[PDB]
Amino acid sequence: QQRTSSLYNKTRQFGITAALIEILSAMSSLEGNAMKGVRRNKFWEG
Amino acid sequence: YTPPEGLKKLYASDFENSKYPLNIVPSDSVLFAKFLYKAAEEKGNFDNILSDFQKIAAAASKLPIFWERTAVVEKIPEFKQLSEPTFFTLVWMQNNGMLELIQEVAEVYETFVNAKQKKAVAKIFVAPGGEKNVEE
Amino acid sequence: FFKTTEMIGYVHSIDGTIATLIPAPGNPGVAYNTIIQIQVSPTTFAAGLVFNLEKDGRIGIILMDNITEVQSGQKVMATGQLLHIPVGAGVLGKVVNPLGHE
Amino acid sequence: FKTTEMIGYVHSIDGTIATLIPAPGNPGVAYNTIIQIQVSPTTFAAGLVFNLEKDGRIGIILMDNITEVQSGQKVMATGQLLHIPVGAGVLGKVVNPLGHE
């Protein structure tokens, strides 16, 4: 009971970390693919 | 900087959606070329822009390495002789830090001019020093 | 009476076994999931497959052969056709690649 | 630390990291060197260079006086890696990683 509890508490910690990492990787991928366009502002009047 | 009224009016319009000789896919280097073409079309003269690019290319050959990241077109004397449309566009790039696209916006502008003037350019790829013999 | 190919652009970037292409202004353009030939030499070509067509006009390419010969700035020709490979009883007893090369 | 010249201004501060925008002319900063952010006219906070971007922006890891650091402050370059006192004159003392007693 003391050996299967540790593996259960060690598993939940790893599961939370991995799922969060996956999501952030997708977030960074969609941020990287995005490109900012030309800024259409009155730059001369600065 | 004190841009002319005509360029100011055009810059605020949706010129990107206007008609052009060719339907090139939108791109960062294409927006500037369209702006130059639209500005030049109003005056009817397009060779002025080509001369400006030639001067820019000649001047860049003497500028220090990585001049496009510390660039100040206003302070650069070589660009002082450029036409208002070209100078405005260069300042436009410098504001966005995209002066490295100078050599590609020119290519698009030439393509638009050739299409408008009904000129077909054939690229002859030859070995180093074979430009002498372009006969076949 | 010339073997005229269909040039569609140049090679911009290379990252391992994949590449990106920039189309030359005013060119026919390439079709999705088609095969293209990267002219590594005036007589030698490397096979690639179209995978992405981006808004900027850039094209994602999956390289298949002669990767080491691919360099940035090389020309690209578009066959305009999907992938076709030899098939028949004449291939039995042989070892082949996915491209059909023995 | 001996300063040589200004190499830009502080732009962003995210906790213990920071970014520097280049000074006019982009003098340049050597990688992995130590830089002095002029938090006060007489006080300079220590930073470590860890990234030289294409645009000219420098990535800095702040070491001390992180709270004092503010955007817009000048940054000077030592031009050398981190060097700390060493020898028998340091025995029996309590120091910090920067060598300060």
Side-chain angles (χ1 to χ4, degrees):
Chain A
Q1 284 173 218
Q2 289 194 297
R3 186 229 291 160
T4 60
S5 70
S6 297
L7 299 163
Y8 165 87
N9 276 333
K10 213 177 163 178
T11 295
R12 67 163 270 278
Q13 292 183 11
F14 296 157
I16 301 162
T17 314
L20 180 57
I21 286 164
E22 164 192 354
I23 297 156
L24 301 170
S25 301
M27 193 179 63
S28 295
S29 174
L30 295 164
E31 289 175 2
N33 305 352
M35 299 304 300
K36 82 212 98 176
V38 169
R39 305 194 298 257
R40 300 283 284 282
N41 75 88
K42 297 194 161 50
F43 52 86
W44 63 88
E45 191 178 17
Chain B
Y1 187 31
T2 60
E5 303 180 5
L7 296 181
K8 288 180 174 177
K9 185 176 181 180
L10 173 56
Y11 176 71
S13 317
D14 291 67
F15 71 94
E16 192 184 13
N17 299 328
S18 301
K19 297 182 179 181
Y20 298 91
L22 301 178
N23 303 328
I24 299 177
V25 68
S27 177
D28 296 331
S29 60
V30 171
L31 183 66
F32 302 103
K34 289 182 172 182
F35 180 88
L36 291 173
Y37 176 86
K38 194 69 175 179
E41 188 176 0
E42 299 182 0
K43 300 181 179 181
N45 187 332
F46 301 96
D47 299 3
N48 297 330
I49 285 68
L50 301 178
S51 300
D52 300 329
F53 289 142
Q54 293 291 359
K55 297 177 179 179
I56 291 169
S61 180
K62 300 181 178 182
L63 297 177
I65 55 184
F66 300 158
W67 65 269
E68 301 115 330
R69 324 186 189 176
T70 102
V72 187
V73 298
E74 300 176 352
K75 301 177 181 178
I76 293 168
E78 300 293 353
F79 304 154
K80 183 60 175 181
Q81 306 298 347
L82 306 174
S83 305
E84 297 177 352
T86 302
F87 188 89
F88 180 89
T89 306
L90 292 176
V91 179
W92 190 9
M93 297 180 178
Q94 184 275 353
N95 181 269
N96 300 322
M98 296 182 178
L99 280 163
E100 303 243 23
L101 309 179
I102 286 169
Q103 299 278 326
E104 298 176 356
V105 169
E107 181 182 4
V108 177
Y109 182 89
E110 293 178 7
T111 302
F112 281 143
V113 168
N114 300 11
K116 184 61 175 59
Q117 298 181 355
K118 298 182 178 181
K119 299 180 179 179
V121 176
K123 296 179 182 179
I124 306 173
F125 306 94
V126 294
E131 73 193 2
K132 323 160 169 188
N133 254 7
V134 284
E135 23 161 64
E136 299 176 355
Chain C
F1 56 98
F2 297 145
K3 298 182 179 180
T4 63
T5 63
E6 188 181 9
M7 179 171 176
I8 53 76
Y10 305 87
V11 179
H12 184 247
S13 64
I14 310 177
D15 187 353
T17 177
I18 62 85
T20 307
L21 310 185
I22 46 172
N27 283 30
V30 66
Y32 188 83
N33 195 27
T34 54
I35 297 289
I36 56 84
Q37 301 292 352
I38 302 173
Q39 188 185 26
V40 301
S41 82
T43 180
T44 311
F45 300 89
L49 182 68
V50 177
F51 195 72
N52 292 343
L53 298 177
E54 304 174 7
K55 292 181 174 181
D56 302 4
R58 296 185 178 181
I59 300 159
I61 298 300
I62 299 161
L63 307 176
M64 301 297 179
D65 60 70
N66 296 328
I67 292 172
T68 61
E69 304 294 349
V70 186
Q71 306 177 15
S72 187
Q74 295 181 341
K75 305 180 187 66
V76 184
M77 315 303 177
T79 61
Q81 303 177 13
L82 302 174
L83 182 62
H84 297 58
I85 60 175
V87 299
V91 184
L92 301 173
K94 298 182 181 178
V95 183
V96 297
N97 290 13
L99 299 178
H101 301 165
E102 301 184 6
Chain D
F1 305 91
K2 299 178 182 179
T3 58
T4 65
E5 57 178 358
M6 182 176 64
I7 53 76
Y9 306 89
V10 181
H11 180 57
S12 64
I13 305 177
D14 179 6
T16 178
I17 56 170
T19 308
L20 310 185
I21 53 168
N26 297 25
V29 182
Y31 180 80
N32 200 32
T33 53
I34 297 295
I35 56 82
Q36 297 296 326
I37 306 184
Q38 191 173 47
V39 296
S40 201
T42 177
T43 313
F44 300 85
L48 182 72
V49 180
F50 82 94
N51 177 21
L52 301 174
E53 296 183 12
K54 191 152 178 162
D55 198 325
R57 298 185 178 183
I58 300 91
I60 300 300
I61 305 176
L62 311 175
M63 313 307 294
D64 44 355
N65 299 3
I66 300 185
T67 61
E68 313 182 6
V69 183
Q70 304 173 216
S71 64
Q73 299 174 349
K74 298 176 177 180
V75 182
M76 289 63 179
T78 66
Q80 299 177 355
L81 302 173
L82 181 59
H83 292 67
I84 55 176
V86 295
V90 188
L91 299 177
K93 296 184 179 179
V94 184
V95 295
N96 63 342
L98 296 176
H100 301 346
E101 301 182 359

